[PDB]
Structure formats: structure tokens, C-alpha cells
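Assemble and predict.
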Amino acid sequence: SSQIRQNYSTEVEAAVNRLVNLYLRASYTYLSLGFYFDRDDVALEGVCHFFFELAFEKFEGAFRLLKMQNQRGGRALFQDLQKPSQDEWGTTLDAMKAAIVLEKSLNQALLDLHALGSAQADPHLCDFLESHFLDEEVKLIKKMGDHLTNIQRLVGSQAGLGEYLFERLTLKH
Amino acid sequence: SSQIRQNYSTEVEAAVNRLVNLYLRASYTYLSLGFYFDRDDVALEGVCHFFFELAFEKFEGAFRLLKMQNQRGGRALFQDLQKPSQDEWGTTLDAMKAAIVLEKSLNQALLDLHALGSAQADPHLCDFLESHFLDEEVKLIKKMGDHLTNIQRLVGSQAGLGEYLFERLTLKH
Amino acid sequence: SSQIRQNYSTEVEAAVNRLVNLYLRASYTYLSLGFYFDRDDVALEGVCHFFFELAFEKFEGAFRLLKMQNQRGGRALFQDLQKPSQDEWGTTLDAMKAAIVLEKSLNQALLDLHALGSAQADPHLCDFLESHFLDEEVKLIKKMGDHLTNIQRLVGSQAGLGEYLFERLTLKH
Amino acid sequence: SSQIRQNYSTEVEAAVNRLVNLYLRASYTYLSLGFYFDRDDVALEGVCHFFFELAFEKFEGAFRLLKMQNQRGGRALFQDLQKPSQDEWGTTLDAMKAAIVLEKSLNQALLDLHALGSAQADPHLCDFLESHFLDEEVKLIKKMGDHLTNIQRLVGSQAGLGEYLFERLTLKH
Amino acid sequence: SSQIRQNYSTEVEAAVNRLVNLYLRASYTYLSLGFYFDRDDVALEGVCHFFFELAFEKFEGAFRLLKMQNQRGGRALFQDLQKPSQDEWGTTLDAMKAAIVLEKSLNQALLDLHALGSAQADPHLCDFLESHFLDEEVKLIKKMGDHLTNIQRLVGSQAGLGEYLFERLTLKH
Amino acid sequence: SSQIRQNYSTEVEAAVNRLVNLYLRASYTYLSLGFYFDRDDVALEGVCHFFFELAFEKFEGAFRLLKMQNQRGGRALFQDLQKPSQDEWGTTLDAMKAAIVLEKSLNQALLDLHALGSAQADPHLCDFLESHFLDEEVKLIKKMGDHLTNIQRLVGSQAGLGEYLFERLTLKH
Ligand SMILES: CCN(CC)c1ccc2nc3c4ccccc4c(=O)cc-3oc2c1
Ligand SMILES: CCN(CC)c1ccc2nc3c4ccccc4c(=O)cc-3oc2c1
Ligand SMILES: CCN(CC)c1ccc2nc3c4ccccc4c(=O)cc-3oc2c1
Ligand SMILES: [Cl-]
Ligand SMILES: [Cl-]
Ligand SMILES: [Cl-]
Ligand SMILES: [Cl-]
Ligand SMILES: [Cl-]
Ligand SMILES: [Cl-]
């Protein structure tokens, strides 16, 4: 087989392909989230833009993973992309809760892959994840947690008002 | 009669004149809406500016229609302009509801005229409507629907607060 | 009623609303004049542009009047807008004669309103009219009189030639 | 045959080739018109330039049609180009009358082709015509009608004077 | 249901959702094509970049469709995304053949949707497709056909040489 | 007849008209050549652009001839334009061979006309041809001969490869 492959296990190759699938699924989920908040009967522009930026971020993550797979001499293999878990995403709070669950699952998949790289003595893979993924994910989950807290603080007894204010004064538009 | 007229039915000519009347009536309605929200006892600058921009837009629509009537060799005929349906327009919500009703009526008149053009095999008219009117109208009705949803979300139990916040944080001033 | 209204009679309020109606009717008349001279079988661009500029001027006059009505704490009330007095406007001479008749009627309405303001000891209204309307109107009627004289001088025995030359060499295109 | 052709009827292909022939014939007619008005014994520069600009416009129309034929996977087929209908074109009025007749024939050919596209459910062809041809033609015929009216107004009893003035004060030089 | 929806059939809404699925599948196919040509054992940079640009184009198409669905008051519904039809894509010729098959299928889906819009008297949908999709697709299929012809001309008896030269001298890098 | 004509024979006048016909026929031939190489199943952009530039050059030649005819007081007379000699033009080699045959025929017509001018003692005509036509033609035929030699050198046993390389590395795109 490969004229470049070196120190790159079949286990890591497969796991990288699985992780691509997870990132692309996450991108799709965020595309659905974005268009839901674009509905005339939802109409929260800042929320919309927040989730579309994440759709792009997750697609970029997948792309970098696929680039690395080729740089290492593995073979990119694509699978079916499962549709997102919901067709409607409820409130901004419901959506941000679903997004943090999603991110925590991606982070766990990154950690799992890092551990596999470590067991396989694959330092390039370990560094790749550390340099492009693990801190980005920590930073994103922190920001989502910050948002959750602010959204929650605003529910009070006037939920609509709080939802509008969060979109207007925290999220970008 | 006309040295330029070609493929331009009397039915379309008349319907174009009727549509001009509808656009000018819509412009007038929006002028009334704008000055109501300019009242010292209403005083919602952003709402005022939103409806004045629409008064100008609807006048522009009428002007383009009249330009096209002449380009086709039809004869512009003006009728009495009915005053707007109300002298006072209630809340921002009441006003935005009235505006979307108005826009839906204009859109239906555009669709009706497009259908007439299609039946008469008048592709220039059909393209004119598609290129300058139908998508502008879809975009406007979408924006009004977005606004309605945000206004509605803000009523809650503190209607005045919500009305102020919508004007301050969504509409332009 | 009004928390701002001071020294502003019901008579002036009503007369201001009537004057708005007159200005908007004048704007409409000028819109009709403009599109007539835009006809392929009339085709006098300079005349067209002259009357469209007046349509805009008269609309601006109405707008300023409505702004002032609100600044004084009166209530803008709109009525039906009568269509213009003609559907076709004849020669440039016929049109300019009709325009000066129209302007003289507006000027008389301004003078009448000024007199009412004076009788009611309403100096703000009197100054408003003097500052934004009376001299603009004198200047416009003078310019129309100048035009009439030039158009008349050009009729001679070659009316078409004179009509073309006036449009080409006096009016803007 | 063609590796790209899709939804593109033989009838439309042939009609497009015929329309190319019509446009190129129109270009040739305008070339003849231009050089006639360039004669020392005619010498109307503005008229000359007006018809040369149209020769170029009609050639561009043909070129776009031929580009589209290839984009659709049809085969451009050229036929003999009939010489223009006259060798001398009379007055500016005679020439502008001949030009509007010509344009009306081109417009009818466009409408005929649009109808064929519609019957064949060929929306690309229908849009192509609407986007690049039908409104350009309406605008041109309107401008020619405007010119005819001005030329006619200037004949009066001093035809030479009127012909000179039209060329000098309306047409570009 | 919807406060904005007007003249927008359930049939069109569903078909738009189906078309989104087709565009996203096409984007995925092009992502796979791109990474295959990025393999160290394939290594055709220009081919890689050509297919990645198409992945982005097809994603943009899907996005515009979803935007329009919301502008019309339809509801975006996502389905599972089928993986691409192949894991390895053979030669540049094999790949470009597969890409033109794919594009022809998308074009047929656009035409089908346009026909449905026409039957339903939905001119906004018909114009949307004409303005953003049908000509882009014709232009792309023409370019692919051009490429196919050039690739085919280069096979001769030295296929590797021809594949290299096409990538180096036609495709962008 | 003519108030400007001087030293300008009927024989030269007629021959100039014939030469215009030849130039316009040549322009048409080059238009056909250009669109053939624009076909999806030919697809040689550089060849396409080479022949379109010549279509424009030959049209310019005709235009200059017609300008000169009027400057001399002759009368431009147009005839039917024969369609080009072929509907399909074969290889780049076949096309360039046909183009040099065409150019040699134009050059001979120029030389013939120069000789007629010389016999008629018409130095203005002789200079006009020398200054705007004879050297342009020599330069063009030299360039075509250069191209023929390069195309011929590239046929070898891999004709497609050679045809691609010539288009890519010699002709402009
Ligand atoms: C409202 C019924 N009527 C009287 C028939 C209106 C309404 C609105 C108008 N708005 C404009 C306008 C708006 C923006 C920029 C330029 C212009 C203009 O030149 C003339 C106008 O004339 C109007 C007449
Ligand atoms: C009149 C019948 N024939 C010969 C078939 C014409 C007529 C007009 C033409 N006008 C152009 C032209 C005009 C403006 C800018 C570029 C071009 C050009 O590149 C080629 C032309 O070729 C023409 C051929
Ligand atoms: C391939 C299947 N999936 C997951 C559903 C894709 C494919 C391609 C995509 N391309 C973009 C994209 C491309 C250019 C510029 C911006 C963006 C963007 O913001 C989001 C994207 O998201 C994508 C998802
Ligand atoms: Cl599968
Ligand atoms: Cl009446
Ligand atoms: Cl009433
Ligand atoms: Cl023949
Ligand atoms: Cl499912
Ligand atoms: Cl003949």
C-alpha cells in the first residue's frame, strides 16, 4: 500500500473517519438549528447567526481531519450522515442545551481519539488534536456555558422578554 | 393608436392602472402610519421611520409601474385615492398586523396580474413583475412576519416595556 | 387631550389638514403631468422632469405640514385624494397654464391660512408659512410665468418647432 | 450526439439559428443606415452614430444567442445574410420609421421564440430571452417612438431646419 | 399555521426539501472527490481544487434553497444524507464523467421543480430557480463538457502524461 | 452628382464595394470558426479567441473601406453575404489552413485593387491600401504560417496531445 504511511495505525485511521462523520453530523445539526431560528415564527437573528457560524466551524473541523488523514496516508471513507435529532429546537435555552450536549459528545470523541493515539505511540496525532481541536472545544464549551447561565438568568417570569434581550444584547447581529 | 405598442393587451393595461392605484393607496396608508407614530402621545421613532420608508417604497413601485405602462405604449389613467382604513393605528402590534394584511393584498394583486400576463402570453410583463416586485414583496412580508413574532414575544405582561424595547433595539433610529 | 398643545386653534388644525390634502392633490396632478409628457406620442423629457420635480416638491410640502401638525399637537387627518382634473394635458403651453392655475390656488390657500393664523394670534404658524412656503411659492410662480412667456414667444406659426426648442434649450435633460 | 444537451428541443435549436440570422441581418441593415447618413450629401453625424450603435447592439445580440446555443449543446448553423431592404434611406424620419419596423419584427421573433420555449417547457431559454432581450427591445422601441414623435413635431413647414435641429439637439455627436 | 405563507403549495415545500437533500448529497460527493484527488497516490491538485470549489457551490445552493423555504413560510425538513456512490473515483476522466452525470441529475430536479411551480402558478419559485440555479447549472455543465473533451483528447496512448498536462495547464493551482 | 468626388473612378468605387463584401464574408467565416471551437465537443478556447479577434479585425477592415468610400464621394452598395464555406471546420490545422487560404484571397483582392488604383492614377487609394491593409495582411499571413508550422510539428503520432498543447502554450486564453 502506502508510500508515505508511517506510524499510523489502522485503528487511528478508522477512528479518524468516524470522527469526520461526527463533525459532519454536528455541522448538519447546526445547519438545522440555524434555519429553525431563521423561521418567521421564531425570528431570532443572533441565535440564527450563532448556530450557522458553528455549522461552518464543524465543517472546517471535518475538513482538517480529512486533510490530516491524507497527510498520514490513511484513506478517507465516508458514511451516511444521520439527520439531526430534532426537526424543531424549542427555545433558545433548549437549543443551547442541545448544543452543549453535542459539543460534550464531540469533546469526548476527541479525548477518546487522543487516548488511542497515546496508547499507539502516535505523537503526531496527539499533537494535531491538541493544536487544532482540544482547546477550541474547551473554549466553545465555556462560551456555551456562559450563554446558558445568561439565558437562564433571563427567564424569570417574562420568558419572551428575556429571550429577545439575550438575542439583542449578547448575540451578534 | 400607438406606434410602439406590441403584445400589450387592454386587460393588462387596465390592470396595471388598477395596481398603480393600489400602490399609491398603500403609500398613503404608510404615510398615515408614519405620522401616527410621530405623535407626541405615541412617540415611537423607529416605528415612524419604518412606515415612512415603506411609504417611499410603495410610491417607487407605483412609479416603476407607470414608467412600464408608458414603455409598453399603454396609457396611465389615475383614479381617486381612497384615504387609509384607519385614522389611528393602535399599538405597534396592531400597526404591523395591518401592514402585513396590506402587503398580502398587494402580493395577491401582483400574482393576479402575473397570471393575467401568463394567460395573455405577455412575457415582458411577467418578467417585469418577477424582477422588480415579487421577490421584493416576499422579502418584505418575511421581515414583517419576523417583526410580528418579536413584537408578540415582548407583550408578555409588560406591554409598554416590550413596545419600547422593540422600537429601541430592533427598529432603526 | 394634548400634553404639548399650546396656542393652537382647532380652526388652524383643520385648515392645516385641508392644506395637506391640497398639497397631496397637487403632487398627484404633477405625477399625472409628468407621465403624460413621458408618453411615446408626447416625448418631451425636459417637461416630464420639470413636472416630476414639482410632484416631489409638493409632496415635501405636505410632509412638512404634517410634521408641523404633530409638533403643535394637532392630529393629522387624511381624506380621499381627488384624481387630477385631466387625463391628457395638451401642449406644453396648456400644461404650464394648468400648473400656474394650480400654484395660484395653493398660494391663495397659504395666504388664507396665514390670515387665519394672524386672526388667531398664532405667530408660530405665521412664521412657519413665511419661512417654508410663501417665498417658495412666489419664486415658483415667477419661474412659471417666465416659462409661459418663453413658450408663448415660440408658438409663432411653427408650434412644434417652438415646443421642441423650449424643451431642449430651457428645460433640463 | 451531445454530452451536455438537456431539455433543449430541435425546434428551439433551429429557431435560435433563425433568430441569429435575423439579428445579423438587422446589424447589416443598421450598418447601411449608418453609412448612408455619413454621405457628404446627407451628413447627419448624430443619426449616423445612432444607427452604428444599433449595428453593434444587434451584432452583440447575435453573439449572445450563438454563445447560448453552444452552452445548451445546440449547433450554430449560419445561412446567407440578405442585403438590407434599401440602398438609400431617405430622411431621418424615413430611416427611424424603417428602424422601428425592423425592431418590431425582431421583437415579434423574440416573442415567438419565447412562446415556443414555453410550449416546450424550456425555462432556461425563456429566462435567457427575458433577461437579455425582451426588456432591451421594449426600451429601444420606446426610445425610437420618442424620436419619431420629436422628428414629426419638427417637420412643420421647414423640414430641413427640423432635421438639422433634431440631429444637433437630440442625437449624440 | 403561517402568518406569511401565500401562494406556496405543500407540493413545492416538500419538493424544495427534497432538492436541498440532493444539493447536500452533491456537496458530499464533491467533498469525497476532492479528498480522493488529494491522496498521495493520486496527487492532482488542480482536480482536487476543482471538486472542492463544487462542494462549496452545492452547499451554497442548498443554503439558498433553505433561505427561500423560510422566506416563503415553508418548513425546512432534513433527511439522512446518503454517502457518495463511490469510495474511489478512478481517473480524472472517470471523475469528470461522474460529475457531469451528477450535475445532469441536479438539473433535471431543478427543471422538474420549475415545472411544478409553473403548474401551481407559483411565479416567485419559478423566478427564484431561473435567477439563481438554471443558468448556473447550464454554465457548469458546459464547462464540464469542455473539460471532458479536453481530457479525452489527451488520453491518446500516453494516459498518464495527458492526465498530468490537463491538471497542470487547464485546472487551477 | 457629387460635390466632393475628385479623381475617383467608377471602377474603383465598384471594386471597393466588392472588397467590402469580401471583408464582411471573411468576418462571417471567422465568426463561424470561433463558435465551432467554442463547441463543448471541440473546446479549444485559445483557437476560439484567435478566430473571434479576426472576425472583429475583418469587420474593422470593411468599416474603414466604407468610411473611405464616403470620404471619396463614392456610394456604398451592399450585397447578399454568402454563408461560410463549411459548417464544421475540423482540426485546428484544418481551420488554420482554411484561414490562410482566406487571407491569401483577401490579399490578392487588395493587390488587384491597388493595381487598378495605379492604372487609374489614384494615389489616395493606393496609399490608403498600403497604409491600412497591405502590411497588416502580410503580418497576419506570416503569423498564420508560423502557427501552421507549429501545429504541424505537434501532430507527430499523438495528434490530440499536440492540439491541446498548441492551444494552451501558443494561443491566448
Ligand atoms: C402618498 C400619496 N402621494 C400623493 C399621490 C405620494 C406619496 C408618497 C410620495 N413619495 C414620493 C417620493 C419619495 C421618495 C423620493 C422621491 C419621491 C418623489 O419624488 C415623489 C413622491 O411623491 C409621493 C406622493
Ligand atoms: C453586419 C454583418 N457583420 C458580418 C457578419 C457584422 C456586423 C457587425 C459586427 N460588429 C462587430 C463588433 C461590434 C462591436 C464590438 C466588437 C465587434 C466584433 O468583435 C465583431 C463584429 O462583427 C460584426 C460583423
Ligand atoms: C458535505 C455535507 N456537509 C454537511 C451537511 C457540508 C458540506 C459542505 C459545507 N460547506 C460549507 C461552507 C462552504 C463555504 C463557505 C462557508 C461554508 C459554511 O459556512 C458551511 C458549510 O457547511 C458544509 C456542510
Ligand atoms: Cl450505505
Ligand atoms: Cl372622479
Ligand atoms: Cl371616506
Ligand atoms: Cl447557400
Ligand atoms: Cl431517520
Ligand atoms: Cl438581392
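The radius of gyration of chain E is 18 Å.
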